[PDB]
Design an enzyme around this catalytic site. Structure first.
Site, short mmCIF file in Angstrom:
data_model
loop_
_atom_site.label_atom_id
_atom_site.label_comp_id
_atom_site.label_asym_id
_atom_site.label_seq_id
_atom_site.Cartn_x
_atom_site.Cartn_y
_atom_site.Cartn_z
CB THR A 1 -7.02 -3.11 -2.94
OG1 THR A 1 -6.61 -2.00 -2.15
CG2 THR A 1 -7.47 -4.27 -2.02
CG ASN B 1 -2.17 0.76 1.10
OD1 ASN B 1 -2.57 1.11 0.01
ND2 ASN B 1 -2.85 1.01 2.23
CG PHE B 2 0.45 3.99 2.34
CD1 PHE B 2 -0.65 4.83 2.28
CD2 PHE B 2 0.54 3.08 3.38
CE1 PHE B 2 -1.62 4.78 3.23
CE2 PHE B 2 -0.44 3.02 4.36
CZ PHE B 2 -1.52 3.89 4.28
CG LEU B 3 2.62 2.94 -6.06
CD1 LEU B 3 4.14 2.91 -6.10
CD2 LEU B 3 2.02 1.99 -7.08
CG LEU C 1 -5.54 -0.60 6.58
CD1 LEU C 1 -4.26 -0.52 7.36
CD2 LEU C 1 -6.70 -0.10 7.41
C1 MYA Z 1 6.88 -10.54 -3.10
C2 MYA Z 1 6.60 -9.12 -2.78
C3 MYA Z 1 5.97 -8.36 -3.92
C4 MYA Z 1 5.65 -6.90 -3.51
C5 MYA Z 1 5.19 -6.10 -4.73
C6 MYA Z 1 3.87 -6.67 -5.22
C7 MYA Z 1 3.22 -5.81 -6.32
C8 MYA Z 1 2.74 -4.50 -5.77
C9 MYA Z 1 2.07 -3.65 -6.83
C10 MYA Z 1 1.75 -2.24 -6.31
C11 MYA Z 1 0.49 -2.16 -5.49
C12 MYA Z 1 0.08 -0.73 -5.21
C13 MYA Z 1 -1.16 -0.69 -4.29
C14 MYA Z 1 -1.55 0.74 -3.99
O1 MYA Z 1 -0.89 1.39 -3.23
S1 MYA Z 1 -2.81 1.43 -4.84
C15 MYA Z 1 -2.55 3.20 -4.64
C16 MYA Z 1 -1.80 3.74 -5.86
N1 MYA Z 1 -1.48 5.12 -5.62
C17 MYA Z 1 -2.12 6.18 -6.14
O2 MYA Z 1 -3.08 6.07 -6.87
C18 MYA Z 1 -1.63 7.55 -5.76
C19 MYA Z 1 -1.80 8.55 -6.87
N2 MYA Z 1 -1.01 8.10 -8.02
C20 MYA Z 1 0.31 8.02 -8.07
O3 MYA Z 1 1.01 8.35 -7.10
C21 MYA Z 1 0.89 7.51 -9.36
O4 MYA Z 1 -0.05 7.83 -10.43
C22 MYA Z 1 1.23 6.02 -9.35
C23 MYA Z 1 2.44 5.71 -8.45
C24 MYA Z 1 0.04 5.20 -8.86
C25 MYA Z 1 1.56 5.56 -10.78
O5 MYA Z 1 2.68 6.32 -11.23
P1 MYA Z 1 2.64 6.97 -12.72
O6 MYA Z 1 1.23 7.39 -13.05
O7 MYA Z 1 3.78 7.96 -12.78
O8 MYA Z 1 2.95 5.68 -13.61
P2 MYA Z 1 4.44 5.30 -14.06
O9 MYA Z 1 4.71 6.02 -15.38
O10 MYA Z 1 5.42 5.44 -12.91
O11 MYA Z 1 4.24 3.72 -14.26
C26 MYA Z 1 3.31 3.22 -15.23
C27 MYA Z 1 3.08 1.75 -14.89
O12 MYA Z 1 2.68 1.59 -13.52
C28 MYA Z 1 1.42 0.91 -13.47
N3 MYA Z 1 0.52 1.37 -12.39
C29 MYA Z 1 -0.12 2.54 -12.36
N4 MYA Z 1 -0.87 2.61 -11.23
C30 MYA Z 1 -0.66 1.47 -10.53
C31 MYA Z 1 -1.14 1.00 -9.32
N5 MYA Z 1 -2.00 1.70 -8.57
N6 MYA Z 1 -0.76 -0.24 -8.91
C32 MYA Z 1 0.11 -0.97 -9.63
N7 MYA Z 1 0.57 -0.54 -10.82
C33 MYA Z 1 0.21 0.69 -11.27
C34 MYA Z 1 0.79 1.19 -14.84
O13 MYA Z 1 -0.12 0.17 -15.23
C35 MYA Z 1 1.97 1.16 -15.75
O14 MYA Z 1 2.25 -0.21 -15.95
P3 MYA Z 1 2.69 -0.82 -17.36
O15 MYA Z 1 2.09 0.12 -18.50
O16 MYA Z 1 4.28 -0.84 -17.42
O17 MYA Z 1 2.10 -2.32 -17.38
C1 75T Z 2 -14.23 11.06 -0.52
C2 75T Z 2 -13.12 10.54 -1.42
N1 75T Z 2 -11.85 10.70 -0.99
C3 75T Z 2 -10.82 10.29 -1.75
C4 75T Z 2 -11.02 9.70 -2.97
C5 75T Z 2 -12.32 9.49 -3.45
C6 75T Z 2 -13.38 9.93 -2.66
C7 75T Z 2 -14.68 9.73 -3.12
O1 75T Z 2 -15.65 9.06 -2.27
C8 75T Z 2 -15.23 7.84 -1.80
C9 75T Z 2 -15.75 7.37 -0.59
C10 75T Z 2 -15.36 6.13 -0.11
C11 75T Z 2 -14.42 5.37 -0.80
C12 75T Z 2 -14.10 4.13 -0.27
C13 75T Z 2 -15.11 3.41 0.41
C14 75T Z 2 -14.82 2.18 0.97
C15 75T Z 2 -13.56 1.63 0.82
C16 75T Z 2 -12.59 2.32 0.09
C17 75T Z 2 -11.20 1.72 -0.08
C18 75T Z 2 -10.54 1.66 1.27
C19 75T Z 2 -9.14 1.04 1.08
N2 75T Z 2 -8.33 1.83 0.11
C20 75T Z 2 -9.01 1.90 -1.18
C21 75T Z 2 -10.36 2.59 -1.00
C22 75T Z 2 -12.87 3.57 -0.46
C23 75T Z 2 -13.91 5.81 -2.01
C24 75T Z 2 -14.34 7.06 -2.50
#
Ligand code: MYA
Ligand code: 75T
Length: 392
Positions: free
Chosen positions: A149, A113-115, A392
């Site tokens: 997730t 989480n918290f990517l 979370l």
């Molecule tokens: C054995 C242990 C293993 C542990 C590791 C297990 C795996 C864990 C996996 C991670 C679990 C995370 C769980 C959570 O925390 S989910 C929460 C994700 N965070 C956010 O949404 C925060 C807001 N966004 C950002 O900070 C950025 O937009 C992020 C960092 C998300 C993408 O940065 P950016 O927009 O600058 O992209 P890029 O140019 O660097 O990279 C593009 C590539 O990255 C792929 N991408 C985009 N979004 C996600 C995403 N949410 N999960 C996995 N992959 C993702 C995308 O398909 C593309 O892939 P491909 O085109 O090459 O196929």
């Molecule tokens: C209010 C809000 N804050 C940040 C982003 C989007 C929104 C919009 O309304 C939402 C309200 C609730 C959720 C939500 C509800 C239940 C579980 C979740 C999971 C909780 C674990 N991390 C991924 C989202 C999100 C998602 C969105």
């Protein structure tokens, strides 16, 4: 089902890959207040937003402390990227350890989480580099599977669940654009629709105490056994994840309630929910949404396999959860369609949210599990028994 590949412990690299010029790897020490603040700074301004840029999740420092230093945690799994010159934290990716059950096989995993990448560094393909590095650090500690997730569609989701939202302070939610005023209605009618009793109804209901740990532990794992994918709680995990410690935690993040039977004085039920704020990005009248999220719960009633009775029991318990959440001044009560939640979400007036949360396993193949919804993305009592882990 089973692992996809076997990792060779001899071949795990002792050194990380290269990063974009001007940046460097940095393990975070979240027992250090300044570094906890640094992570919070990054997340506060750069973590998950909605598609209309109205809201951004606002994890508190107390929440991060709780979520990231759970039993078994390692600082090596709290991964940061820093700018070499300024020392500024510009990216993160984090894991904590737990055991899960995947169709009756127990698996040691990391929960990821918290990517997060600073907006100015997006679209530079840093995310694969972050993923590969936390994978390497996990491999070194003998962990080869992960669960996580995301809201984006990635290859082979194990399940998907819809978001649901129960207005508690509807007016608050209206003024921030969270909840609409339907064409035919007024503020008064919406407040009326969402009104809740002043007091709870379940007999014996009280805040969970440390003395309740063993009994809740037993009940929770029996209940979660009813699900194909679930979290295999340890006792220390029940203590950490469910029992708020007021002496040492200034800002409460977790609320837990147990039902102590009036007759037998055994714990027959429990539920819990956590505090996760959202930042209201641009609004005159409000700065945040104070949201409560449904977490784990269990009830002895489940074990009769009498769905009508389970339905009845959950309707009372979960309405009590709403009332308690309201009393704690939460604006909205959020849930997913996992566990047995389709049994009560609609009837207790949770409104359907947008899209789905997808669930993923790394390095583990198993058949898809039902996520609480049918083909229409609507709650369905015949599509439960699948997802028994909340993350979370
Ligand atoms: C054995 C242990 C293993 C542990 C590791 C297990 C795996 C864990 C996996 C991670 C679990 C995370 C769980 C959570 O925390 S989910 C929460 C994700 N965070 C956010 O949404 C925060 C807001 N966004 C950002 O900070 C950025 O937009 C992020 C960092 C998300 C993408 O940065 P950016 O927009 O600058 O992209 P890029 O140019 O660097 O990279 C593009 C590539 O990255 C792929 N991408 C985009 N979004 C996600 C995403 N949410 N999960 C996995 N992959 C993702 C995308 O398909 C593309 O892939 P491909 O085109 O090459 O196929
Ligand atoms: C209010 C809000 N804050 C940040 C982003 C989007 C929104 C919009 O309304 C939402 C309200 C609730 C959720 C939500 C509800 C239940 C579980 C979740 C999971 C909780 C674990 N991390 C991924 C989202 C999100 C998602 C969105």
């Amino acid at each position: 089902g089973g692992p996809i590949k076997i990792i060779d412990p001899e071949k795990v690299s002792k050194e990380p890959d290269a990063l974009l010029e001007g940046f460097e790897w940095a393990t975070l020490d979240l027992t250090n207040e300044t570094e906890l603040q640094e992570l919070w700074d990054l997340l506060t301004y750069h973590y998950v937003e909605d598609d209309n840029a109205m809201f951004r999740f606002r994890y508190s420092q107390s929440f991060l402390h709780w979520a990231l230093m759970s039993p078994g945690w390692k600082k090596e799994w709290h991964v940061g990227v820093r700018a070499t010159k300024s020392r500024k934290l510009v990216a993160s990716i984090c894991g904590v350890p737990t055991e899960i059950n995947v169709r009756n096989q127990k698996l040691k995993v990391v929960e990821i989480n918290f990517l997060c990448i600073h907006k100015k560094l997006r679209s530079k393909r840093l995310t694969p580099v972050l993923i590969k590095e936390i994978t390497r650090r996990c491999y070194l500690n003998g962990i080869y599977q992960a669960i996580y997730t995301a809201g984006v569609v990635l290859p082979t989701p194990v399940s998907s669940c819809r978001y649901y939202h129960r207005p508690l302070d509807w007016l608050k939610l209206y003024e921030v654009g969270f909840s609409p005023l339907p064409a035919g209605s007024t503020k008064a009618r919406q407040i009326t629709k969402n009104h809740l009793p002043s007091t709870t109804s379940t007999p014996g209901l009280r805040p969970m105490e440390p003395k309740d740990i063993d009994t809740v532990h037993d009940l929770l794992q029996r209940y979660l056994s009813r699900f194909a994918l679930n979290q295999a709680f340890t006792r220390e995990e029940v203590d950490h994840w469910l029992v708020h410690k007021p002496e040492t935690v200034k800002e409460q993040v977790v609320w837990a309630y147990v039902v102590e039977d009036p007759e037998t004085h055994k714990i027959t039920d429990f539920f819990s929910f956590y505090n996760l704020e959202s930042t209201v990005i641009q609004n005159p009248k409000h700065d945040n949404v104070r949201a409560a999220y449904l977490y784990y719960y269990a009830t002895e009633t489940a074990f009769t396999n009498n769905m009508k009775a389970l339905k009845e029991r959950l309707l009372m318990l979960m309405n009590d959860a709403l009332i308690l959440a309201k009393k704690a001044h939460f604006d909205v009560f959020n849930a997913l369609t996992l566990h047995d939640n389709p049994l009560f979400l609609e009837q207790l007036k949770f409104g359907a949210g947008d899209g789905q949360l997808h669930f993923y396993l790394y390095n583990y193949r198993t058949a898809p599990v039902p996520g609480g919804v049918n083909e229409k993305n609507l709650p369905d009592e015949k599509r439960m028994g699948g997802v028994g882990i909340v993350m979370l």
